[PDB]
Amino acid sequence: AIPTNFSISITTEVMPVSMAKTSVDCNMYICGDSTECANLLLQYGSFCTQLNRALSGIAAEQDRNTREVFAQVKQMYKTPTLKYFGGFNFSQILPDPLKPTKRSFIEDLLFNKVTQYGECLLICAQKFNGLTVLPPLLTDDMIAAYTAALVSGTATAGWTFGAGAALQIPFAMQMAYRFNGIGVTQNVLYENQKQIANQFNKAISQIQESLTTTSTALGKLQDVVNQNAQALNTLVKQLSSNFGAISSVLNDILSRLDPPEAEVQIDRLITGRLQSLQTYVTQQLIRAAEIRASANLAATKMSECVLGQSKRVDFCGKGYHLMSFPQAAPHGVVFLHVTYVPSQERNFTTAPAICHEGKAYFPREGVFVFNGTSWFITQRNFFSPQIITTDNTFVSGNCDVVIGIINNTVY
Amino acid sequence: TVLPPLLTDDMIAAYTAALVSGTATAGWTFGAGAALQIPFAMQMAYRFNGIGVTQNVLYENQKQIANQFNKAISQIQESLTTTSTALGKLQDVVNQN
Amino acid sequence: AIPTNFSISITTEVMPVSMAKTSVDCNMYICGDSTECANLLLQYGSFC
Amino acid sequence: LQTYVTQQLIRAAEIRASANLAATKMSECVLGQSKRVDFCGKGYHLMSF
Amino acid sequence: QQFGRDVSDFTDSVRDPKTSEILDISPCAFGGVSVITPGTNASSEVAVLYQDVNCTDVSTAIHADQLTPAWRIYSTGNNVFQTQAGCLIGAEHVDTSYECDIPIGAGICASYHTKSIVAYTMSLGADSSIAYSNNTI
Ligand SMILES: *[C@@H]1O[C@H](CO)[C@@H](O[C@@H]2O[C@H](CO)[C@@H](O[C@@H]3O[C@H](CO)[C@@H](O)[C@H](O[C@H]4O[C@H](CO)[C@@H](O)[C@H](O)[C@@H]4O)[C@@H]3O)[C@H](O)[C@H]2NC(C)=O)[C@H](O)[C@H]1NC(C)=O
Ligand SMILES: *[C@@H]1O[C@H](CO)[C@@H](O[C@@H]2O[C@H](CO)[C@@H](O[C@@H]3O[C@H](CO)[C@@H](O)[C@H](O[C@H]4O[C@H](CO)[C@@H](O)[C@H](O)[C@@H]4O)[C@@H]3O)[C@H](O)[C@H]2NC(C)=O)[C@H](O)[C@H]1NC(C)=O
Ligand SMILES: *[C@@H]1O[C@H](CO)[C@@H](O[C@@H]2O[C@H](CO)[C@@H](O[C@@H]3O[C@H](CO)[C@@H](O)[C@H](O[C@H]4O[C@H](CO)[C@@H](O)[C@H](O)[C@@H]4O)[C@@H]3O)[C@H](O)[C@H]2NC(C)=O)[C@H](O)[C@H]1NC(C)=O
Ligand SMILES: *[C@@H]1O[C@H](CO)[C@@H](O[C@@H]2O[C@H](CO)[C@@H](O[C@@H]3O[C@H](CO)[C@@H](O)[C@H](O)[C@@H]3O)[C@H](O)[C@H]2NC(C)=O)[C@H](O)[C@H]1NC(C)=O
Ligand SMILES: *[C@@H]1O[C@H](CO)[C@@H](O[C@@H]2O[C@H](CO)[C@@H](O)[C@H](O)[C@H]2NC(C)=O)[C@H](O)[C@H]1NC(C)=O
Ligand SMILES: *[C@@H]1O[C@H](CO)[C@@H](O[C@@H]2O[C@H](CO)[C@@H](O)[C@H](O)[C@H]2NC(C)=O)[C@H](O)[C@H]1NC(C)=O
Ligand SMILES: *[C@@H]1O[C@H](CO)[C@@H](O[C@@H]2O[C@H](CO)[C@@H](O)[C@H](O)[C@H]2NC(C)=O)[C@H](O)[C@H]1NC(C)=O
Ligand SMILES: *[C@@H]1O[C@H](CO)[C@@H](O[C@@H]2O[C@H](CO)[C@@H](O)[C@H](O)[C@H]2NC(C)=O)[C@H](O)[C@H]1NC(C)=O
Ligand SMILES: *[C@@H]1O[C@H](CO)[C@@H](O[C@@H]2O[C@H](CO)[C@@H](O)[C@H](O)[C@H]2NC(C)=O)[C@H](O)[C@H]1NC(C)=O
Ligand SMILES: *[C@@H]1O[C@H](CO)[C@@H](O)[C@H](O)[C@H]1NC(C)=O
Ligand SMILES: *[C@@H]1O[C@H](CO)[C@@H](O)[C@H](O)[C@H]1NC(C)=O
Numbered sequence: 203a204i205p206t207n208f209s210i211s212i213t214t215e216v217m218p219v220s221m222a223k224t225s226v227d228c229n230m231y232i233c234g235d236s237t238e239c240a241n242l243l244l245q246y247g248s249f250c251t252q253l254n255r256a257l258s259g260i261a262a263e264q265d266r267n268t269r270e271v272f273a274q275v276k277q278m279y280k281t282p283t284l285k286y287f288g289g290f291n292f293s294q295i296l297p298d299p300l301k302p303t304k305r306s307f308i309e310d311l312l313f314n315k316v317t318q319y320g321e322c323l324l325i326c327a328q329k330f331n332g333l334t335v336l337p338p339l340l341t342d343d344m345i346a347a348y349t350a351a352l353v354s355g356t357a358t359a360g361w362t363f364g365a366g367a368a369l370q371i372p373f374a375m376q377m378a379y380r381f382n383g384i385g386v387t388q389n390v391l392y393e394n395q396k397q398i399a400n401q402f403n404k405a406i407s408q409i410q411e412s413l414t415t416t417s418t419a420l421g422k423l424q425d426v427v428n429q430n431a432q433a434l435n436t437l438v439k440q441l442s443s444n445f446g447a448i449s450s451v452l453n454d455i456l457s458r459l460d461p462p463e464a465e466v467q468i469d470r471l472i473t474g475r476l477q478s479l480q481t482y483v484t485q486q487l488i489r490a491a492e493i494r495a496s497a498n499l500a501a502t503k504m505s506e507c508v509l510g511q512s513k514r515v516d517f518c519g520k521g522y523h524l525m526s527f528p529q530a531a532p533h534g535v536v537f538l539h540v541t542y543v544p545s546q547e548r549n550f551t552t553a554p555a556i557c558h559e560g561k562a563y564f565p566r567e568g569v570f571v572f573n574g575t576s577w578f579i580t581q582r583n584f585f586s587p588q589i590i591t592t593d594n595t596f597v598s599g600n601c602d603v604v605i606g607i608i609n610n611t612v613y
Numbered sequence: 614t615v616l617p618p619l620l621t622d623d624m625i626a627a628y629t630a631a632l633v634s635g636t637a638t639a640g641w642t643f644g645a646g647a648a649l650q651i652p653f654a655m656q657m658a659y660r661f662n663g664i665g666v667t668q669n670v671l672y673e674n675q676k677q678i679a680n681q682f683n684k685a686i687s688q689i690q691e692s693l694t695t696t697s698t699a700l701g702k703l704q705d706v707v708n709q710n
Numbered sequence: 711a712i713p714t715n716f717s718i719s720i721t722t723e724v725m726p727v728s729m730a731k732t733s734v735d736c737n738m739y740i741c742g743d744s745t746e747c748a749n750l751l752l753q754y755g756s757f758c
Numbered sequence: 759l760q761t762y763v764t765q766q767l768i769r770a771a772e773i774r775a776s777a778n779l780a781a782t783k784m785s786e787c788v789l790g791q792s793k794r795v796d797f798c799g800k801g802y803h804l805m806s807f
Numbered sequence: 808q809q810f811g812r813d814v815s816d817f818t819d820s821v822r823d824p825k826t827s828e829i830l831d832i833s834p835c836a837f838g839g840v841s842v843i844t845p846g847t848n849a850s851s852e853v854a855v856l857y858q859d860v861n862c863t864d865v866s867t868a869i870h871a872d873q874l875t876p877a878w879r880i881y882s883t884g885n886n887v888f889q890t891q892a893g894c895l896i897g898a899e900h901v902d903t904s905y906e907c908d909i910p911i912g913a914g915i916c917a918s919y920h921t922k923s924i925v926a927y928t929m930s931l932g933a934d935s936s937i938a939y940s941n942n943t944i
């Protein structure tokens with residue numbers, strides 16, 4: 203069975219690259235800045251510093267993850283004036299020049315579907331517990347500049363983008379070069395650029411419908427949010443636990459008890475709350491490494507996919523990968539993969555070799571295919587009945603040594 | 614309590630048996646696009662060609678190739694029957710739990 | 711040096727994809743059916 | 759109880775590591791043909807089961 | 808209603824017991840401190856960085872002498888730069904744009920230029936251009 207026709211469609215791929223980096227002051231968490239707190243707390247020696255170093259090391263990774271993933275392009279390119287190349291319409295993927303948002307329309311659809319603790323917005327505020335969330339090194343605007351200078355680069359320079367300096371080429375030129383890489387002749391490209399453009403522009407509007415009408419494609423981004431929510435909420439909720447004292451309030455234990463026992467119960471209050479943080483440090487230390495595993499996916503799915511050609515199956519989506527376009531998102535990367543999908547199959551009949559002039563005639567590539575009227579060489583990706591010559595076949599040995607041949611002629 | 618998994622033992626090998634039954638007839642297009650019918654030596658001649666030996670070598674030698682891995686399949690059945698330490702990494706998953 | 715003959719062979723590998731999934735009744739593990747345990751369990755909060 | 763849950767979250771991160779490498783070899787080396795050296799058996803890969 | 812609590816369980820607002828004014832109760836202030844340095848082999852001045860705090864309440868309590876820690880030899884130097892991460896004290900905000908040397912937060916990034924410690928806005932990369940036509944390789 204060999205397919206005839208084909209239909210390019212585009213598959214979305216979603217993965218997280220960073221998590222919300224935090225920090226904790228211990229004194230404003232452990233007690234609430236009381237003197238009776240700080241008295242007993244210094245007989246443990248240094249324990250806040252070990253918690254300061256771990257939450258810093260988590261906080262360094264989140265920038266380092268997003269830096270490696272995005273900043274692989276060292277030449278920021280001006281987004282081209284024409285955004286309509288060869289009949290293909292990149293206008294919803296490049297940043298649109300009208301609005302001062304410097305985002306695509308599609309990236310705007312990505313923020314609107316996934317969008318306590320002290321944080322400053324430059325309106326600053328601060329909470330009683332010592333919890334705080336710090337802002338990253340790389341703002342949201344700079345990421346969208348890297349995405350824009352990456353889509354603009356391969357809308358112009360093609361596969362040459364990552365070989366060094368990005369080298370200018372026509373768009374339909376390199377689109378044919380990616381058709382060689384999937385084992386399809388580029389006649390299919392050049393002779394069909396109208397309806398390939400009709401399909402390519404159709405699919406991007408179809409994904410646009412999807413991200414507006416339905417949801418849950420970016421649940422892998424919300425999941426990063428929901429684990430920051432629960433770990434910070436559960437850390438709060440163990441303030442009101444007593445750990446065996448008369449109260450969760452340090453001042454009630456202070457007031458109504460003698461220093462023979464008020465010392466003892468707030469000493470329980472301390473080590474009860476040191477282990478609540480030491481819990482919180484560890485579970486933040488684990489899933490930092492689960493994000494760092496998903497970070498080096500997105501680092502390799504941007505080099506080996508967007509800057510080159512994918513050869514591995516279902517890597518960069520189902521079907522024959524052609525090219526792929528990154529988009530940003532809050533704490534994540536949303537990919538768009540341009541895929542080649544064959545269709546319209548026909549039942550034909552094969553022969554491994556043909557017997558002619560008493561000799562053994564092998565196909566040089568592909569197979570000899572007999573449709574019921576004539577023999578010809580064509581490939582399995584696509585039907586194209588190339589007439590058997592002396593050139594597209596080759597000779598080794600004589601007839602009737604390999605098994606199951608067809609007696610035939612070679613021009 | 615140890616909970617029972619969602620995919621039982623029967624449905625696991627039902628995927629695997631359907632998977633090998635696919636690629637005995639469908640070829641490398643079984644993963645790329647749809648499963649497409651192809652005779653089996655045609656798949657082998659292709660996969661010879663993809664590793665840098667032209668398909669001269671299959672067609673001239675369709676029985677030496679048939680004899681060799683039909684031997685080598687049964688040697689695994691000898692080595693799985695008799696000896697050990699070839700499935701240790703599956704048992705150490707069971708031990709560490 | 712150029713090889714002239716060849717030999718095909720099957721080699722095996724094995725990978726775990728799963729492990730045993732468990733669950734723990736926190737109530738019955740710590741207390742073990744004493745209600746006076748369970749009264750002092752509640753002041754430790756929703757740790758279970 | 760808290761210690762046991764921590765030493766399960768590590769090992770479930772070990773399984774999640776290698777189950778991604780099992781879903782990759784099954785995608786590439788079974789449903790396709792690999793060209794990656796000393797990956798999916800040794801020698802020149804033909805197909806796999 | 809006596810007084811108010813937040814979405815969490817701390818008290819954040821109170822009705823005044825004599826005149827019924829609805830005050831807000833905020834924390835007093837705190838935060839972390841970074842020290843930014845080019846190294847002992849280059850300099851011995853540094854710019855400290857008071858994280859996540861309004862620069863109004865920073866600069867006052869240093870003049871009004873209410874920080875713990877307290878420094879023996881230390882001056883504001885009239886260089887306090889309000890940024891997203893905090894209140895940078897000691898580095899001159901240049902309005903230039905270089906590659907990032909030492910990270911701070913939200914595109915602000917310290918460095919050591921001709922010499923003193925300078926802070927600025929991070930550059931992403933060189934703005935190149937690729938001319939485009941349909942017939943040229
Ligand atoms: C490339 O693809 C893009 C896809 O975004 C496409 O550009 C878009 O085209 C639509 C219509 O073709 C534009 O929508 C218009 O926007 C203007 C902005 O002011 C509106 O005023 C218009 O609304 C009026 O007309 C509608 C017609 O029915 C009415 O329904 C409506 O109520 C108003 O009367 C109109 O909708 C859209 O702005 C552009 N987007 C961009 C970024 O240009 C473009 O056509 C494609 N190009 C090619 C060459 O194929
Ligand atoms: C650090 O703390 C200082 C105070 O110590 C704080 O300064 C204050 O900020 C607020 C805003 O957060 C200012 O309020 C507004 O400022 C503008 C700018 O002049 C005024 O025009 C405003 O007056 C109009 O706007 C109001 C609401 O929009 C109307 O209700 C009103 O009737 C007016 O029409 C308004 O005053 C405030 O002025 C300053 N005060 C001082 C002394 O600076 C600063 O914002 C804090 N910084 C950080 C980073 O948190
Ligand atoms: C490349 O390697 C392959 C395998 O290593 C090799 O194929 C082998 O060829 C030889 C000769 O054609 C085969 O050996 C014969 O096998 C038959 C079948 O069992 C036996 O009957 C033969 O026995 C005769 O010879 C013996 C030794 O002299 C006598 O003791 C006996 O009584 C018989 O007279 C003989 O063993 C061998 O089986 C194959 N191997 C396979 C797997 O088929 C091939 O020849 C090599 N290439 C080159 C160019 O040599
Ligand atoms: C190969 O596949 C493509 C698409 O998969 C085929 O193109 C489509 O062909 C159909 C007819 O089979 C066209 O439908 C017609 O459309 C016009 C205008 O919309 C309408 O007036 C007709 O009534 C009918 O609906 C369709 O437009 C066309 N698509 C495009 C983008 O051109 C193509 O025909 C296939 N090749 C062969 C040889 O059949
Ligand atoms: C089988 O393929 C051959 C070509 O390989 C087809 O033969 C051609 O038929 C068209 C129209 O019928 C003619 O214009 C050409 O001159 C023929 N060329 C040759 C070389 O024969 C044949 O039609 C195909 N059969 C079927 C059923 O599609
Ligand atoms: C407590 O006493 C003060 C003054 O003694 C009260 O303040 C007066 O409040 C009324 C309305 O509540 C105003 O009309 C008067 O103008 C206020 N007095 C002055 C001198 O300005 C206050 O209301 C009293 N508290 C309560 C709860 O009633
Ligand atoms: C501090 O930096 C200075 C450079 O200004 C270093 O001094 C020079 O070091 C190089 C090799 O490291 C030698 O070739 C020169 O002869 C050195 N010059 C002098 C005057 O010593 C110095 O070693 C550095 N010190 C540290 C501790 O980093
Ligand atoms: C080759 O084409 C490139 C297309 O950009 C030309 O590059 C620019 O040319 C302008 C003036 O012609 C210069 O100001 C720019 O600095 C060039 N940019 C780059 C990246 O080179 C280039 O001039 C052409 N070269 C020749 C020999 O025709
Ligand atoms: C490709 O772009 C070139 C511009 O460099 C177009 O070539 C010009 O076409 C106009 C009319 O279409 C002529 O008057 C000019 O003399 C052409 N100049 C050159 C340098 O070729 C060309 O039309 C574009 N290709 C297509 C298919 O429109
Ligand atoms: C044609 O191919 C389809 C799909 O493989 C198959 O179902 C059908 O039976 C085939 N027809 C013939 C005549 O072989
Ligand atoms: C194909 O199989 C049929 C039986 O199904 C057999 O008669 C025929 O000889 C076979 N042909 C080849 C080339 O193996």
Ligand SMILES: *[C@@H]1O[C@H](CO)[C@@H](O)[C@H](O)[C@H]1NC(C)=O
Nearest residue numbers: 557558601602607608609610
């Ligand atoms: C092909 O036909 C010729 C007669 O024209 C015959 O001599 C030859 O043996 C045939 N070959 C095969 C493989 O049947």
